[PDB]
Amino acid sequence: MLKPQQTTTRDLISLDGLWKFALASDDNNTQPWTSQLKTSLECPVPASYNDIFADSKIHDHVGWVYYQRDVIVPKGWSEERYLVRCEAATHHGRIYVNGNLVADHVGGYTPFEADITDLVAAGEQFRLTIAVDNELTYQTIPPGKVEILEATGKKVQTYQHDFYNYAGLARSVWLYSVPQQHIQDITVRTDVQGTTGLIDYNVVASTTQGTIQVAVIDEDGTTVATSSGSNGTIHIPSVHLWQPGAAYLYQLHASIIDSSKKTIDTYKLATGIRTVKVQGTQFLINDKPFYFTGFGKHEDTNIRGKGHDDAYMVHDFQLLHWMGANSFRTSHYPYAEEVMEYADRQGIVVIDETPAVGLAFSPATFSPDRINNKTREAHAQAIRELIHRDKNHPSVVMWSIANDPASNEDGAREYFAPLPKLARQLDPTRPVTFANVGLATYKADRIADLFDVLCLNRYFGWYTQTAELDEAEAALEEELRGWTEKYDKPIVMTDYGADTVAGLHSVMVTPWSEEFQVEMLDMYHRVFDRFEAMAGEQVWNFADFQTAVGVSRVDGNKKGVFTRDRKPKAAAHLLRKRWTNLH
């Protein structure tokens, strides 16, 4: 269902706060959810739990953890229908109402919920336990594999992606109410004919006794159009288009109306009128060529892990405007819905990506004992959920299906082939892409032709022709010449960068140094501007972020242009100079 909001017809209670917290264990208490949890530990919920507690055992935990609290359903909600919703449980969430399992969800970055109307009476209190599991298998979306250290028996988690496997309730939890007859879903699609804007809409509602009205209201509160029925086409004269760098949002009120013209349900959906098209080598937004500038990001801050944070969100966006970035990519998982809403209002463009990173063991990655058909089922599910959630965001301009898959290997094409089609079939308003790793050159990649736009991640300066910038220039150039001569598509660079410790400086060519970072980004730009087919450049990464432990990671990933606490490295000023002095 739609992201819940408070209306004249719907109530919404935040369940964020401190919750009682416990790890699972091998105790005579298998089944925590059946009674009041016994812990002195409280974990705040919009948070990953790993770094909260300054305890190694919680942090390194593999398997289930339990959050618990008492909740009271408002007495004035009799005659209504109500649900508990998790915006996200990373990676596998279960919801329990007093000992009853009521939901079981498997991906780590999308919503789920349970209708508890008939299980708990209005004005009743109940014990809400949400179990969350972090275990990654070859069938989970980021895939991974649990192993056991030989000498100690410590359970340990392997995976093939960078960012740390933060787990828990990294996004908000909610109790909300909906009327018996309610709106369940809305799809809006937006074209333009000359200066007239056209909204294709479809409303899905629980019942049909009494009907659907729609109103489109501009930023001034003026109703600009109306329509009747659960689906149709709304004409808007002299539309205020939604543009990169100049958002405009209309406000689409779907109501349910009874036999009298009395309102039964209402829901307010923000929509931007905008078109995306790929014509040969150009990426077009409202029939105007567009060039991405900005970053791959991560949901990651000093203590709350992947926990959504309003201050860092508003600030991060403020830093984007400051340096003239116009976009970012939801690198390696869908971000919080509230970030997409904020991008819509800020006029920021978004490459929206599924959690499907780490489909690469470089042993054959696409075989029965690795990424296999059941894995592809999970991947298809992730695509559906993401698209289902973010279909109405004008900011979201393209779906990224995966990140660094081993798209050079036998079996990779048979694995991915259905996936671009599924996305295009669920949402025909946007192009589909994926982010290509260096192994999969223009020669070796065997997947690229099934996508509408090509995204490349490349580290010539850092990882291969190390500190040898001229050597990296030549190989970068060759490569790009290969892609441009082989495909007639837009090419957006989505990773390029270098680990850089703030404060570390050198007059020489010195990796990890602030000067080196600048020298490399600067060179990459020089090469980009030589190629007409480039449609975007997004630096890796916006900010330093935590990764799994490893001798080649200095307390995480330091390829940020800002520090974890958002202080600018020299590179940040270079991009600022570049992106504000060119379109």
Ligand X SMILES: CC1(C)[C@@H](O[C@H]2O[C@H](C(=O)O)[C@@H](O)[C@H](O)[C@H]2O)CC[C@]2(C)[C@H]3C(=O)C=C4[C@@H]5C[C@@](C)(C(=O)O)CC[C@]5(C)CC[C@@]4(C)[C@]3(C)CC[C@@H]12
Binding status of residue 506 toward a copy of itself by CB under 8 A: yes
Binding status of residue 568 toward a copy of itself by CB under 8 A: yes
Query: Do 383 and 432 contact (CB within 8 A), yes or no?
Result: no
Binding status of residue 439 toward ligand X by CB under 6 A: yes
Binding status of residue 52 toward a copy of itself by CB under 8 A: no
The nearest distance, CB 163 to ligand X, in angstroms, is 7
The nearest distance, CB 439 to a copy of itself, in angstroms, is 35
- The tokens for 485 are 């001569």
- Compute how many residues bind ligand X; rule: CB under 6 A: 13
> Measured from the CB atom, is 421 or 577 closer to a copy of itself?
577
Q: Consult the annotation and say whether 559 binds a ligand.
A: yes
Binding status of residue 507 toward a copy of itself by CB under 8 A: yes
> Measured from the CB atom, is 174 or 540 closer to ligand X?
540
Q: What is the spatial distance between Cα 239 and Cα 245, in angstroms, rounded to a whole number?
A: 17
The nearest distance, CB 510 to a copy of itself, in angstroms, is 10
Q: What is the spatial distance between Cα 527 and Cα 142, in angstroms, rounded to a whole number?
A: 33
Query: Residue 231, preceding bond cis, omega within 30 degrees?
Result: no
Q: How far is CA 332 from CA 2, 117, 405, in A?
A: 23, 36, 12
Q: What is the spatial distance between Cα 189 and Cα 174, in angstroms, rounded to a whole number?
A: 28
Tell me which stretch binds a copy of itself (CB under 8 A): 74-82, 395-403, 422-430, 495-503: 495-503
The count of other CB atoms within 10 Å of the CB of residue 474 is 14
What φ, ψ does residue 473 adopt, rounded to 5°?
-55, -60
The nearest distance, CB 579 to a copy of itself, in angstroms, is 15
The 8-class DSSP code of residue 76 comes to G
Return the residues of window 57-96 that contact a copy of itself according to CB under 8 A. none
373-390 helix and 418-426 helix, angle to the nearest 10 degrees: 20
Query: Do 533 and 491 contact (CB within 8 A), yes or no?
Result: yes
Residue at token pair 């080196």: 516
Q: What is the spatial distance between Cα 86 and Cα 229, in angstroms, rounded to a whole number?
A: 31
Of 295, 69, 311, nearest to 173 (Cα)? 69
319 binds, among ligand X, a copy of itself, none (CB under 5 to 8 A by kind): a copy of itself
Q: How far is CA 62 from CA 55, 140, 176, 212, 472, in A?
A: 14, 15, 32, 48, 41
Q: Consult the annotation and say whether 463 binds a ligand.
A: yes
H-run or E-run covering 472:
helix 469-486
Q: What is the spatial distance between Cα 95 and Cα 90, in angstroms, rounded to a whole number?
A: 13
Beta strands in 106-195 (DSSP E): 112-115, 125-133, 144-148, 155-159, 173-178, 183-193
404 binds, among a copy of itself, ligand X, none (CB under 5 to 8 A by kind): ligand X
Return the residues of window 304-333 that contact a copy of itself according to CB under 8 A. 319, 322
Residues in a beta bridge with 81: 178
Q: Consult the annotation and say whether 557 binds a ligand.
A: yes
Query: Do 141 and 108 contact (CB within 8 A), yes or no?
Result: yes
Residue at token pair 């048979």: 414
What φ, ψ does residue 2 adopt, rounded to 5°?
-55, 155
Q: Consult the annotation and say whether 576 binds a ligand.
A: no
288 binds, among a copy of itself, ligand X, none (CB under 5 to 8 A by kind): none
Tell me which stretch binds ligand X (CB under 6 A): 177-185, 194-202, 303-311, 434-442: 434-442
Binding status of residue 503 toward a copy of itself by CB under 8 A: yes
Binding status of residue 479 toward ligand X by CB under 6 A: no
The SS3 call for residue 480 is: helix
Tell me which stretch binds ligand X (CB under 6 A): 191-199, 218-226, 419-427, 458-466: 458-466
The nearest distance, CB 279 to a copy of itself, in angstroms, is 38
- The tokens for 14 are 């935040």
Tell me which stretch binds ligand X (CB under 6 A): 128-136, 306-314, 457-465, 512-520: 457-465
Query: Do 386 and 432 contact (CB within 8 A), yes or no?
Result: no
Residues in a beta bridge with 492: 455, 536
Binding status of residue 457 toward ligand X by CB under 6 A: yes
The 8-class DSSP code of residue 221 comes to S
The SS3 call for residue 528 is: helix
Binding status of residue 548 toward ligand X by CB under 6 A: no
Residue at token pair 């779906």: 399
> Measured from the CB atom, is 190 or 457 closer to ligand X?
457
Q: What is the spatial distance between Cα 471 and Cα 310, in angstroms, rounded to a whole number?
A: 43
Tell me which stretch binds a copy of itself (CB under 8 A): 176-184, 276-284, 381-389, 503-511: 503-511
> Measured from the CB atom, is 134 or 513 closer to a copy of itself?
513
Binding status of residue 494 toward ligand X by CB under 6 A: no
Q: What is the spatial distance between Cα 208 and Cα 265, in angstroms, rounded to a whole number?
A: 12
438 binds, among a copy of itself, ligand X, none (CB under 5 to 8 A by kind): ligand X
Binding status of residue 505 toward a copy of itself by CB under 8 A: yes
Binding status of residue 550 toward ligand X by CB under 6 A: no
Binding status of residue 511 toward a copy of itself by CB under 8 A: no
The nearest distance, CB 425 to ligand X, in angstroms, is 28
The nearest distance, CB 463 to ligand X, in angstroms, is 4
Q: What is the spatial distance between Cα 494 and Cα 456, in angstroms, rounded to a whole number?
A: 6
382, 557, 558, 561: residue in contact with ligand X (rule CB under 6 A): 557
Q: What is the spatial distance between Cα 519 and Cα 580, in angstroms, rounded to a whole number?
A: 19
365, 390, 569, 579: residue in contact with a copy of itself (rule CB under 8 A): 569
Q: Consult the annotation and say whether 553 binds a ligand.
A: yes
Binding status of residue 502 toward a copy of itself by CB under 8 A: yes
Q: Consult the annotation and say whether 154 binds a ligand.
A: no
133 binds, among ligand X, a copy of itself, none (CB under 5 to 8 A by kind): none
Read off the amino acid at residue 302. N
Binding status of residue 407 toward ligand X by CB under 6 A: no
The nearest distance, CB 392 to ligand X, in angstroms, is 29
- Which residues are part of a known binding site for alpha-D-glucuronate? 162, 459, 463, 553, 557, 559
Residues lying near ligand X in the complex (CB under 6 A): 162, 404, 437-439, 457, 459, 463-464, 495, 540-541, 557
- Which residues are part of a known binding site? 162, 459, 463, 553, 557, 559
Residues lying near a copy of itself in the complex (CB under 8 A): 319, 322, 501-507, 514-515, 563, 567-570, 572-573
